[PDB]
Design an enzyme around this catalytic site. Structure first.
Site, mmCIF file in Angstrom:
data_model
loop_
_atom_site.group_PDB
_atom_site.id
_atom_site.type_symbol
_atom_site.label_atom_id
_atom_site.label_comp_id
_atom_site.label_asym_id
_atom_site.label_seq_id
_atom_site.Cartn_x
_atom_site.Cartn_y
_atom_site.Cartn_z
ATOM 1 N N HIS A 41 0.819 -1.207 0.000
ATOM 2 C CA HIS A 41 0.000 0.000 0.000
ATOM 3 C C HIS A 41 0.857 1.263 0.000
ATOM 4 C CE1 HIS A 41 0.217 -0.049 4.564
ATOM 5 N NE2 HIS A 41 0.254 1.267 4.359
ATOM 6 N N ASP A 83 -0.149 -7.654 1.542
ATOM 7 C CA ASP A 83 0.378 -6.297 1.537
ATOM 8 C C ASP A 83 1.900 -6.235 1.634
ATOM 9 O OD1 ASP A 83 0.334 -3.544 1.485
ATOM 10 O OD2 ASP A 83 -0.216 -3.298 3.592
ATOM 11 N N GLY A 174 2.660 5.958 8.683
ATOM 12 C CA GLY A 174 4.062 6.220 8.435
ATOM 13 C C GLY A 174 4.950 5.044 8.803
ATOM 14 N N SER A 176 4.133 1.768 8.110
ATOM 15 C CA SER A 176 3.956 0.666 7.166
ATOM 16 C C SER A 176 5.235 0.201 6.515
ATOM 17 C CB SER A 176 3.006 1.072 6.063
ATOM 18 O OG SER A 176 1.674 1.088 6.598
ATOM 19 N N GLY A 177 5.322 -1.103 6.261
ATOM 20 C CA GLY A 177 6.506 -1.656 5.631
ATOM 21 C C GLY A 177 7.620 -1.870 6.630
#
Ligand code: K7J
Length: 224
Positions: A41, A83, A174, A176-177
């Protein structure tokens, strides 16, 4: 990261930040000299990768442009299942004591395992407060049967839940990942949660990396 604290200096050499110009977009992890693993995303036309410093915006941090990215083919912009995405650096990253490849898992850690999630995401929600120092918080893996009770149909098989009972400790925008590490290996990538962030008993949801090593490995081999 909500209700956390600065990560130990130099303890996250595989943590990177994906920036839009010089503005934080998402977190990420260094897989090898040419690849960053992050959330699907977080997809953008191109990125600027920050590496080698727990201080976001560190003037002495390594910065690399990334133009190619590849989301898992099963990713849904609707449900966020699968994701995860691989981002190819335009030039190879310089490895050092502060820039290292993350250790991918060979197995899935069981429910109850204590882990650490990190990121430069907002430390407050809905009102945003962005930290300069990489923030950390320890959470525990939650079983799918236990997580389903909360998220029901929102939960998919390759999603991993983690949190602390009756606690605000969690990931937020912020982050994410970003990495969720348990006992030495990368077990998850920050994917989603509820809004506002830090709602007690609303687990953070991560992409369960131990279910994707085959795709990660083949994808890197594919783009040479
Ligand atoms: C992209 C990444 O930085 C970010 C990280 C994150 C993690 C936990 C909480 C907030 C943010 N992930 C996301 O933004 C993902 C992907 C885009 C949507 N998203 C969400 O986490 C959104 C904000 N969450 C929801 O939509 C959840 C399912 N709904 C609610 O919280 C409303 C219903 C309720 O409050 O029960």
């Amino acid at each position: 990261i909500i209700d956390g604290a600065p990560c130990a200096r130099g303890s996250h050499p595989w943590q990177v930040a994906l920036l839009s110009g010089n503005q934080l977009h998402c977190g990420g992890v260094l897989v090898n000299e040419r690849w960053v693993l992050t959330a699907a995303h977080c997809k953008m036309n191109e990125y600027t990768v920050h590496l080698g410093s727990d201080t976001l915006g560190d003037r002495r941090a390594q910065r690399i442009k990334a133009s190619k990215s590849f989301r898992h083919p099963g990713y849904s912009t609707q449900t966020h299942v699968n994701d995860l995405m691989l981002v190819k650096l335009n030039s190879q990253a310089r490895l050092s004591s502060m820039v290292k490849k993350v250790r991918l898992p060979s197995r899935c850690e069981p429910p109850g395992t204590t882990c650490t999630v990190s990121g430069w995401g907002t430390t407050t929600s809905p009102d945003v407060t962005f930290p300069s120092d990489l923030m950390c918080v320890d959470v525990k893996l939650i079983s799918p049967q236990d997580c389903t009770k909360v998220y029901k149909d929102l939960l998919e098989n390759s999603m991993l839940c983690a949190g602390i009972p009756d606690s605000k400790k969690n990931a937020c925008n912020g982050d994410s990942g970003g990495p969720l590490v348990c006992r030495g290996t990368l077990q998850g990538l920050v994917s989603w949660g509820t809004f506002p962030c830090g709602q007690p008993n609303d687990p953070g949801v991560y992409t369960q990396v131990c279910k994707f090593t085959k795709w990660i490995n083949d994808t890197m081999k594919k783009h040479r």
